[PDB]
Amino acid sequence: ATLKVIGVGGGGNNAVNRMIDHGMNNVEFIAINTDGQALNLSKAESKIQIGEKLTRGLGAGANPEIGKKAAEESREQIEDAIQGADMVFVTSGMGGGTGTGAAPVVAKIAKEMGALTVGVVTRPFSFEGRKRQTQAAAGVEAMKAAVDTLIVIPNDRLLDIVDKSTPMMEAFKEADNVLRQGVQGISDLIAVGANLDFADVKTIMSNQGSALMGIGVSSGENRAVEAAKKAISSPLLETSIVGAQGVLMNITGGESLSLFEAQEAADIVQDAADEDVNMIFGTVINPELQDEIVVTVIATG
Ligand SMILES: Nc1nc2c(ncn2[C@@H]2O[C@H](COP(=O)(O)OP(=O)(O)OP(=O)(O)O)[C@@H](O)[C@H]2O)c(=O)[nH]1
Numbered sequence: 001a002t003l004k005v006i007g008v009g010g011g012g013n014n015a016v017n018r019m020i021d022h023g024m025n026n027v028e029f030i031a032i033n034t035d036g037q038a039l040n041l042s043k044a045e046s047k048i049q050i051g052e053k054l055t056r057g058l059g060a061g062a063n064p065e066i067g068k069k070a071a072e073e074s075r076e077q078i079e080d081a082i083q084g085a086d087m088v089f090v091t092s093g094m095g096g097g098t099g100t101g102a103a104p105v106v107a108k109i110a111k112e113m114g115a116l117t118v119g120v121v122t123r124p125f126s127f128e129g130r131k132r133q134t135q136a137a138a139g140v141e142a143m144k145a146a147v148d149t150l151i152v153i154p155n156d157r158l159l160d161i162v163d164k165s166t167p168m169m170e171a172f173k174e175a176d177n178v179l180r181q182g183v184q185g186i187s188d189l190i191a192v193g194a195n196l197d198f199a200d201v202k203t204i205m206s207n208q209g210s211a212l213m214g215i216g217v218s219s220g221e222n223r224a225v226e227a228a229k230k231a232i233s234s235p236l237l238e239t240s241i242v243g244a245q246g247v248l249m250n251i252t253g254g255e256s257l258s259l260f261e262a263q264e265a266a267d268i269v270q271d272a273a274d275e276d277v278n279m280i281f282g283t284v285i286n287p288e289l290q291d292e293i294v295v296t297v298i299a300t301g
């Protein structure tokens with residue numbers, strides 16, 4: 001199962017850059033932008049400049065019409081970069097011209113090509129003003145129409161987890177962890193073996209609206225509950241787990257992994273989930289983990 005991560009627009013490229021720098025592997029990174037200079041600064045293995053004839057290598061100047069038109073004209077390049085992917089993550093900051101306009105097009109192409117398509121986008125800080133926000137909301141609507149599952153990160157949530165002195169790059173790295181947990185969560189679920197596979201992923205995620213993808217790690221007596229609570233919690237997400245209609249859940253531990261622990265973790269997630277939840281639950285024994293427990297949760301709907 002091949003995973004690709006596609007960053008669209010300035011924010012998208014920045015996320016790709018920060019994540020490649022902090023060493024993601026066995027994932028293909030693709031950078032797409034109208035802005036030629038941005039692309040030159042990209043560490044991404046595969047780069048696509050869109051809308052050359054529109055912008056002459058400039059950005060979209062906050063015009064979403066441009067980003068959309070640029071993406072549509074480069075359909076052939078975009079398809080070619082995508083082909084072979086089983087699952088695609090399109091990441092982008094909403095509110096500008098390139099991301100807002102081109103990211104839904106990129107996402108729609110991937111979904112039409114048959115890839116399981118996940119969007120991870122940001123809404124701008126309130127201080128960026130009412131017009132940026134409104135424009136971003138249009139982006140979010142378009143993304144939601146184009147993806148299998150969408151994950152929205154309001155940039156304002158970053159303000160809630162920093163103090164007066166927290167460096168901006170650290171804050172942005174926190175936001176990157178949202179996409180990171182999603183990507184390694186899948187990669188592990190598909191890795192041999194959890195008695196779970198990509199077919200399970202597709203059942204839980206295909207056409208499911210919104211998604212949460214989390215990983216919790218813990219130890220000690222309350223380890224199972226603690227790991228699970230970590231996995232289903234993030235203050236950066238617009239979407240809580242309550243009412244989920246689909247859950248893919250895996251618990252990994254050493255030989256000490258008890259049946260009661262698995263039940264405890266599963267009950268944590270099950271309480272939050274809707275009565276008619278489609279839950280696919282897996283367990284993996286990995287002696288390497290010693291006293292550690294790892295809980296992975298993908299929730300949708
Ligand atoms: N979390 C996070 N958000 C970002 C980052 N960079 C930009 N954003 C957000 O994304 C929104 C869009 O900014 P850009 O991605 O730079 O704009 P663009 O998509 O390239 O569009 P144009 O520059 O007009 O062509 C901004 O309003 C910010 O709120 C980033 O590095 N991290």
Ligand SMILES: [Mg+2]
Pocket residue numbers: 009010035059060096098
């Ligand atoms: Mg730009």
